[PDB]
Scaffold this active site. Structure first.
Site, PDB file in Angstrom:
ATOM      1  N   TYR A  64      -7.867   0.374  11.564  1.00 27.58           N
ATOM      2  CA  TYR A  64      -7.496   0.632  12.958  1.00 27.58           C
ATOM      3  C   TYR A  64      -7.209   2.095  13.267  1.00 27.58           C
ATOM      4  O   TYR A  64      -6.754   2.838  12.402  1.00 27.58           O
ATOM      5  CB  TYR A  64      -6.164  -0.073  13.278  1.00 27.58           C
ATOM      6  N   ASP A  91       3.240   0.075   9.194  1.00 27.22           N
ATOM      7  CA  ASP A  91       2.452   1.291   8.989  1.00 27.22           C
ATOM      8  C   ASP A  91       3.214   2.536   8.535  1.00 27.22           C
ATOM      9  O   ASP A  91       2.615   3.412   7.923  1.00 27.22           O
ATOM     10  CB  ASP A  91       1.618   1.593  10.229  1.00 27.22           C
ATOM     11  CG  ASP A  91       0.542   0.545  10.465  1.00 27.22           C
ATOM     12  OD1 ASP A  91       0.236  -0.255   9.543  1.00 27.22           O
ATOM     13  OD2 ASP A  91       0.004   0.511  11.576  1.00 27.22           O
TER      14      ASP A  91
HETATM   15  N1  LIG Z   1      -0.661   8.828   4.581  1.00 28.72           N
HETATM   16  C1  LIG Z   1      -1.762   8.943   3.976  1.00 28.72           C
HETATM   17  N2  LIG Z   1      -2.263  10.153   3.705  1.00 28.72           N
HETATM   18  C2  LIG Z   1      -2.504   7.711   3.552  1.00 28.72           C
HETATM   19  C3  LIG Z   1      -1.822   6.648   2.972  1.00 28.72           C
HETATM   20  C4  LIG Z   1      -2.513   5.512   2.566  1.00 28.72           C
HETATM   21  C5  LIG Z   1      -3.893   5.428   2.746  1.00 28.72           C
HETATM   22  O1  LIG Z   1      -4.544   4.290   2.338  1.00 28.72           O
HETATM   23  C6  LIG Z   1      -5.955   4.125   2.494  1.00 28.72           C
HETATM   24  C7  LIG Z   1      -6.372   2.786   1.919  1.00 28.72           C
HETATM   25  C8  LIG Z   1      -5.390   1.729   2.389  1.00 28.72           C
HETATM   26  C9  LIG Z   1      -5.736   0.347   1.852  1.00 28.72           C
HETATM   27  C10 LIG Z   1      -6.582  -0.389   2.852  1.00 28.72           C
HETATM   28  O2  LIG Z   1      -5.844  -1.398   3.508  1.00 28.72           O
HETATM   29  C11 LIG Z   1      -5.025  -1.230   4.591  1.00 28.72           C
HETATM   30  C12 LIG Z   1      -5.289  -1.942   5.751  1.00 28.72           C
HETATM   31  C13 LIG Z   1      -4.453  -1.827   6.854  1.00 28.72           C
HETATM   32  C14 LIG Z   1      -3.344  -0.998   6.796  1.00 28.72           C
HETATM   33  C15 LIG Z   1      -2.427  -0.866   7.959  1.00 28.72           C
HETATM   34  N3  LIG Z   1      -2.835  -0.916   9.150  1.00 28.72           N
HETATM   35  N4  LIG Z   1      -1.126  -0.719   7.725  1.00 28.72           N
HETATM   36  C16 LIG Z   1      -3.068  -0.297   5.628  1.00 28.72           C
HETATM   37  C17 LIG Z   1      -3.905  -0.416   4.530  1.00 28.72           C
HETATM   38  C18 LIG Z   1      -4.578   6.495   3.331  1.00 28.72           C
HETATM   39  C19 LIG Z   1      -3.883   7.633   3.728  1.00 28.72           C
END
Ligand SMILES: N=C(N)c1ccc(OCCCCCOc2ccc(C(=N)N)cc2)cc1
Ligand SMILES: *[C@@H]1O[C@H](CO)[C@@H](O[C@@H]2O[C@H](CO)[C@@H](O[C@@H]3O[C@H](CO)[C@@H](O)[C@H](O)[C@@H]3O)[C@H](O)[C@H]2NC(C)=O)[C@H](O)[C@H]1NC(C)=O
Ligand SMILES: *[C@@H]1O[C@H](CO)[C@@H](O[C@@H]2O[C@H](CO)[C@@H](O)[C@H](O)[C@H]2NC(C)=O)[C@H](O)[C@H]1NC(C)=O
Ligand SMILES: *[C@@H]1O[C@H](CO)[C@@H](O[C@@H]2O[C@H](CO)[C@@H](O)[C@H](O)[C@H]2NC(C)=O)[C@H](O)[C@H]1NC(C)=O
Ligand SMILES: *[C@@H]1O[C@H](CO)[C@@H](O[C@@H]2O[C@H](CO)[C@@H](O)[C@H](O)[C@H]2NC(C)=O)[C@H](O)[C@H]1NC(C)=O
Ligand SMILES: *[C@@H]1O[C@H](CO)[C@@H](O[C@@H]2O[C@H](CO)[C@@H](O)[C@H](O)[C@H]2NC(C)=O)[C@H](O)[C@H]1NC(C)=O
Ligand SMILES: *[C@@H]1O[C@H](CO)[C@@H](O[C@@H]2O[C@H](CO)[C@@H](O)[C@H](O)[C@H]2NC(C)=O)[C@H](O)[C@H]1NC(C)=O
Ligand SMILES: N=C(N)c1ccc(OCCCCCOc2ccc(C(=N)N)cc2)cc1
Ligand SMILES: [Ca+2]
Ligand SMILES: [Ca+2]
Ligand SMILES: [Ca+2]
Ligand SMILES: [Ca+2]
Ligand SMILES: [Cu+2]
Ligand SMILES: [Cu+2]
Lengths: 715, 710
Positions: free
Chosen positions: A425, A337
């Site tokens: 999550y 994460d």
């Molecule tokens: N920092 C930020 N502002 C930020 C960075 C990435 C993000 O992305 C949203 C879409 C991500 C794609 C959807 O899929 C997953 C599923 C599980 C996890 C996990 N639990 N690691 C990560 C992504 C949103 C906010």
């Protein structure tokens, strides 16, 4: 209290000042993050860069100058023949003049492939899917009623899983196709797609493989063909759009015993009993600073109790969810994460729900994949709450129908909390401070599970939770950095165990006494203090100072781990190189500025060859007698999903962490300075004397009305 | 309420059982308070649970209420061959009969096994006072306290148990202390071994004496050697260190009261007698004078989860340099764990808003005794949502926020036998998860400091060693998942290593879900050596809508380990502590893992848990009972002065629904809040109960501190 500023996050003003300074260097050819091309130069992340501990401590403890304040700036260099990611330290603050190299990794070539995904990249991915999946349009409508082209309220969506390929340098992502409805995470269609999105020219991007309902198909056209020719066993999904959707939080069902009123609530008529000013906190015996690192998350720094240091830093380092699956996406998923800005998905805490209505709620600013610094309302909260159990109590009976006294101290705790909701999550991160010098770190899991399309073969890797839904088996693992400085920088590490002895019974020679004794074990080298999951973990894990308490015992703090974690991946195998820390529930290292972190934002997308391998910190097996030590702690649990996880995983029984407890550190119970203690004493022929040092409180107050914003924008 | 079948005896019922026994002149009964051991007396009366077969036919099949009875323990000391015999007295109301229980042919140590009593203490004290007269000047010179004409400077003693080296002995080591505030932490350095087995206290003798690391044989001998200059003596307003009174200063002093719970709309649980309703939950409870708290007939959503969850025994196993220290293995059921449920202080022991419940005990008493605020029942916010989710739109906004405020129902009592206070909780979450918890606080068991003691404990004050020990607690967990007949199953993660199905030259090494079935009791007896599976499941043959067996999961929170060597002497008393988890087929002959007799005859007790496993019965589709050991090593430290604190000093277990309900069972709660965005306007805050900001005051603080007949 102004000193805590050294640990403080960058302000909106400072973020802008750093961003402006970077933009004033015309040779960087910087463009906004929202520009929808990969072949661009952009500033991906800006956050405060902690000064060296040597300098901070001289500032804090020896009256020396404030260390220079700097920001970490991560620049994506896409607009060149050999794209890369380079970091700089920008300073000083205020008045930035320089950008110097930061975490340089010369000779490594996969930095571009290792970089986090971004909004611009997602937009291009959606464009790639809309074009590439055109042959499947009619298939989509027939099987799901939703589509990628010409959709409005019936759109398909995708969730990408990481890592993205089979080796370092690859950027090939499996995508789980879902219906974009309320709680869309739980609505897979049965299609998954592999896209190679490595090139900075999105026109080169290709769907290289297709999986649908148990079979691979090679291309969208091939699946389209075989479907047209009636050769595909398809699953036609029912219409989703009176009863709530199974993936909604909306209430349904009725309890047999109706609950029509609000439950009990905290009131705080006297206001906070802690002193929060900036990022500095005072609470009885406690003194600490905090920050919220955009990349990795919450930290508490310079933690004292009784005017003496206990820990220089306690911080979240990484949080992972390691999956198995029947589908390609499922068997691919190892989420790290920090690769998603764990510390910058601190979304708005709902007063009365996420924290008590009586909490102090705090805003922050993040610059992570953004054009400008972004305001995050109620990103953190700090609050005192009754634990419901007294810190200590005693009924001193007279064994004659009465008593000599009752004594008790009402249980309270201070809680510093944030959350991280990257996508499905929601993790809840607490640092908890008890009035007797105990502190506790805790993570709770809630929100939506990571889930794939049901087929019978899925039952070997998870649980059927709904008609078309499998909750994949996985393990949550969290790594913490625990830089204890027990009464000072120089510490040792030792453990205590009970060991039986078998002696002649001293008062009855014909007999034996088999009984407990106290065994101490000292540790001199890092490797000796690296406890693997197979190894027996001693019951007392002590970090000691050479100073003795008044009774001749060394002043120590004890680490107590609350976990169900175990070894998940085999040591040395491929992606396991990204998470070598997860070999160790506890490991102790000698402090080093080159070893401040066990992970990084790059680990998710190059787990094969990441910039930090925790195992390497143990290679030199350094002496750890009378040294600046860092404890590193892994906690977690296997999660086999079950139907009660629908719509969301719940927090009861789904938390892990650890406690730091004084052990011969103080001369007696450090909570004795609390004036909340009450002692009731009997009196002959009269009512009891209730001895207090603070008057009884029955005052009332009211919290402000509930509000919630839901937006996070530049200011 | 049908839950009355599980209810403890009222004051009226206790008096009725006592009257009936006293009307039998041939019993020669005398009050507990009569200061001779050569008497017959009723030591204990409590309700005796009917057979489960009859209780379930009453509850589930509309049959007759079972016969209500009392258990009556009679000390027969007024006869040539003293013994303890237990009887079932019934029926209630209107007792007619008295039937002897649980004979042990060949067992001769019944009388020795019996618990200590107030009358025995008065006689012990008389023996000490007389036997130690030669040490009077020694006492004054070394401590400034004594046993004679002492007034505000009196010595006291703490007995340890067990009491001898073999079954049938009653030879107790006594730790001599200064009787001051928190006297437990004031040992003088003298310990005394007293043989008090005879029913004629005239025969009782000090047979051995220990002072400051040496044995002396008699008080006379120690006295003479003291006089002759042949004893190494230790000669022993801010508050006393053993006092709770505040001293010291925080760097940031706190002068005001902290936040508190308000409950303006009253309790959200329903309490009728001993029956509790709360959201999905239905259960009954009792406070067994001998063994402590129980919850029974636990239901969620109208379906049975557990017939019984009960504390069975709680032990503290010590090591030491002094003979008292190395002797001490306390087994608290041997002290009436369930009848030292002393008054809960409102605001401190339970929230000010709690419902406080009284009870009656008849244990070593002349009449039934009223115990005010012996238990409490309360709802409290946990301070962490039961569930929450921020559904981002990833474009600076959101699709919704959904959250459910955390609350839990807590049923609590305590037990303070003497020095320590245990806090016993049964906790019920709105999503069908229940939790058992024990917290330790109060005063540690401590002995006199010498250098040699540092091998068995920690110096906590000038003259004080905190002895090393382990706390172990046993729970009986009679799960009846959706019904009486269950199986036991565990799940683990096991890796597979396959060809990557989309890149054949590569491998996928990944988790798979492995299920293990258990057919025989012995397979489900997990020793501390054995690796405990992460999923411990009690399953019904019924399936949920998704094809998975309906189950409850047991999750243990413990730091326990093997303490005593299996098979060695006193370990016979605590064979259950071999097993963090063991599973047995239900038997009426195996309702309890301990007894009030184990403390004083741990060598040959009436219940040996290991024997429950000897027949190694089939546990496929049976009435199963999980038995759970939890505990922790406690090496005392200076912060334990004056009392051990509760933070981090708790153990227990959770019982979690696992594929039992079709979806999250907390979805029935109307407390859930969802916030939705609205085009060009403020957000819609959707609720199913109105927002509440009302405040009210609780009852003013009061505390009685007495417990007397009514
Ligand atoms: N920092 C930020 N502002 C930020 C960075 C990435 C993000 O992305 C949203 C879409 C991500 C794609 C959807 O899929 C997953 C599923 C599980 C996890 C996990 N639990 N690691 C990560 C992504 C949103 C906010
Ligand atoms: C990652 O990309 C950055 C930015 O493209 C690289 O740093 C840049 O390196 C180039 C040289 O390759 C420097 O450009 C100029 O080179 C000419 C040579 O004709 C020289 O005369 C100029 O003085 C100038 O240095 C440029 O200064 C430098 N940019 C920055 C911001 O440092 C970086 O080397 C790449 N990293 C790796 C590992 O390849
Ligand atoms: C503690 O040590 C004693 C002394 O060695 C052990 O007692 C001996 O046990 C064996 C049986 O295994 C007998 O043959 C001897 O007669 C015993 N000797 C004495 C002097 O009593 C005892 O078994 C040991 N116990 C434990 C639990 O280790
Ligand atoms: C969330 O917060 C923002 C910032 O306060 C709100 O934007 C303001 O809205 C009010 C209308 O009540 C205007 O008076 C201001 O001009 C706005 N300020 C800015 C900086 O935009 C917004 O209304 C809030 N949104 C919700 C849904 O409550
Ligand atoms: C324990 O003592 C009791 C009481 O003296 C004995 O119980 C009596 O036994 C005699 C002869 O067996 C009967 O006639 C009486 O009816 C019994 N009295 C009562 C009150 O039950 C008993 O035998 C002794 N128990 C053991 C195991 O020796
Ligand atoms: C998973 O299985 C594969 C195949 O058996 C193992 O890979 C082999 O490893 C040996 C020893 O390193 C090599 O000489 C072979 O060439 C490998 N074969 C193939 C087909 O790759 C691999 O080591 C196993 N991994 C784990 C963690 O068990
Ligand atoms: C503890 O409770 C008892 C029982 O209620 C109290 O005794 C009563 O006191 C009142 C006030 O003087 C008397 O008028 C009653 O006659 C008493 N009732 C009984 C049954 O004795 C007692 O005062 C309380 N003790 C303390 C210290 O508060
Ligand atoms: N931790 C331990 N096991 C323990 C520790 C010390 C101790 O030392 C002094 C003796 C105790 C004196 C008080 O004894 C009783 C017995 C029963 C009841 C009852 N159940 N009503 C109430 C009081 C006794 C037990
Ligand atoms: Ca090292
Ligand atoms: Ca350190
Ligand atoms: Ca059996
Ligand atoms: Ca059962
Ligand atoms: Cu999970
Ligand atoms: Cu203890």
């Amino acid at each position: 209290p102004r000193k805590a500023g050294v640990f403080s996050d960058l302000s909106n003003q400072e973020l802008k000042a750093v961003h402006s300074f970077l933009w004033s260097k015309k040779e960087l050819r910087l463009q906004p993050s929202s520009t929808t091309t990969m072949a661009k130069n952009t500033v991906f992340l800006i956050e405060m860069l902690l000064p060296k501990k040597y300098h901070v401590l001289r500032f804090l403890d020896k009256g020396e100058r404030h260390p220079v304040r700097e920001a970490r700036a991560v620049i994506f260099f896409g607009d060149q023949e050999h794209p890369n990611v380079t970091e700089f330290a920008v300073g000083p603050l205020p008045g930035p003049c320089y950008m110097r190299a930061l975490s340089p990794r010369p000779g490594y070539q996969s930095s571009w492939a290792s970089r986090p995904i971004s909004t611009a990249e997602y937009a291009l991915l959606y464009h790639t899917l809309q074009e590439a999946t055109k042959p499947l349009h009619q298939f989509f409508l027939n099987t799901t009623g939703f589509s990628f082209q010409d959709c409005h309220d019936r759109c398909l969506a995708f969730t990408d899983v990481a890592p993205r390929g089979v080796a370092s340098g690859q950027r090939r992502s499996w995508l789980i196709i879902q219906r974009y409805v309320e709680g869309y995470f739980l609505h897979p269609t049965g299609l998954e797609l592999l896209v190679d999105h490595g090139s900075t020219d999105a026109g080169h991007w290709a769907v290289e493989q297709v999986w649908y309902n148990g079979k691979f198909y090679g291309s969208p056209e091939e699946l389209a063909r075989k479907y047209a020719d009636g050769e595909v066993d398809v699953v036609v999904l029912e219409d989703p759009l009176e009863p709530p959707l199974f993936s909604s939080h909306k209430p349904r069902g009725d309890f047999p015993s109706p609950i029509h009123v609000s439950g009990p609530r905290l009131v705080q008529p006297h206001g906070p009993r802690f002193r929060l000013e900036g990022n500095a906190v005072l609470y009885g015996g406690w003194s600490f600073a905090f920050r919220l690192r955009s990349s990795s998350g919450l930290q508490v720094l310079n933690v004292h109790f009784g005017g003496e240091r206990i820990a220089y830093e306690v911080s979240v380092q990484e949080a992972v969810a390691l999956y198995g699956g029947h589908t390609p996406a499922g068997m691919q998923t190892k989420y790290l994460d920090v690769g998603w800005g764990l510390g910058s998905v601190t979304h708005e805490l709902a007063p009365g729900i996420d924290c008590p209505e009586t909490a102090t709620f705090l805003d922050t600013f993040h610059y992570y994949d953004a054009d400008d610094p972004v305001h995050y309302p109620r990103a953190l909260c700090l609050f005192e709450m009754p634990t419901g159990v007294p810190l200590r109590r005693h009924f001193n009976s007279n064994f004659k129908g009465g008593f000599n006294f009752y004594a008790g101290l009402k249980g309270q705790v201070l809680v510093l909390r944030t959350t991280s909701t990257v996508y499905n999550y929601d993790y809840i991160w607490d640092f908890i401070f008890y009035p007797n010098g105990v502190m506790e770190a805790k993570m709770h899991a809630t929100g939506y599970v990571h889930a794939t399309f049901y087929t019978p073969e899925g039952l070997r890797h998870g649980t059927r939770l709904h008609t078309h839904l499998i909750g994949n088996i996985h393990t949550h693992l969290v790594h913490y950095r625990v830089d204890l400085d027990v009464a000072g920088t120089k510490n040792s590490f030792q453990t205590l165990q009970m060991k039986l002895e078998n002696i002649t019974n001293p008062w009855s020679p014909r007999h034996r006494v088999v009984q407990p004794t106290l065994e101490q074990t000292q540790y001199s080298w890092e490797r000796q203090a690296a406890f693997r999951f197979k190894r027996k973990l001693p019951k007392y894990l002590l970090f000691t100072s050479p100073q003795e308490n008044p009774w001749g015992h060394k002043r120590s703090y004890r680490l107590q781990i609350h976990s169900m974690a175990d070894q998940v991946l085999p040591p040395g195998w491929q992606e396991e190189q990204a998470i070598t820390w997860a070999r160790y529930p506890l490991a102790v290292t000698k402090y080093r500025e080159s070893e401040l972190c066990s992970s990084s934002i790059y680990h998710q997308n190059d787990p094969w060859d990441p910039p930090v391998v925790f195992e390497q910190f143990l290679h030199n097996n350094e002496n750890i007698e009378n040294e600046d030590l860092v404890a590193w702690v892994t906690v977690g649990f296997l999660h086999i999903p079950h139907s009660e996880d629908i719509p969301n995983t719940a927090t009861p029984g789904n938390s892990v962490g650890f406690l730091l407890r004084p052990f011969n550190f103080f001369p007696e119970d450090p909570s004795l300075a609390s004036r909340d203690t009450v002692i009731v004493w009997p009196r002959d022929n009269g009512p009891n004397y209730v001895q207090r040092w603070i008057p009884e409180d029955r005052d009332c107050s009211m919290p402000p009305p509930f509000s919630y914003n839901g937006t996070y924008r530049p200011v």
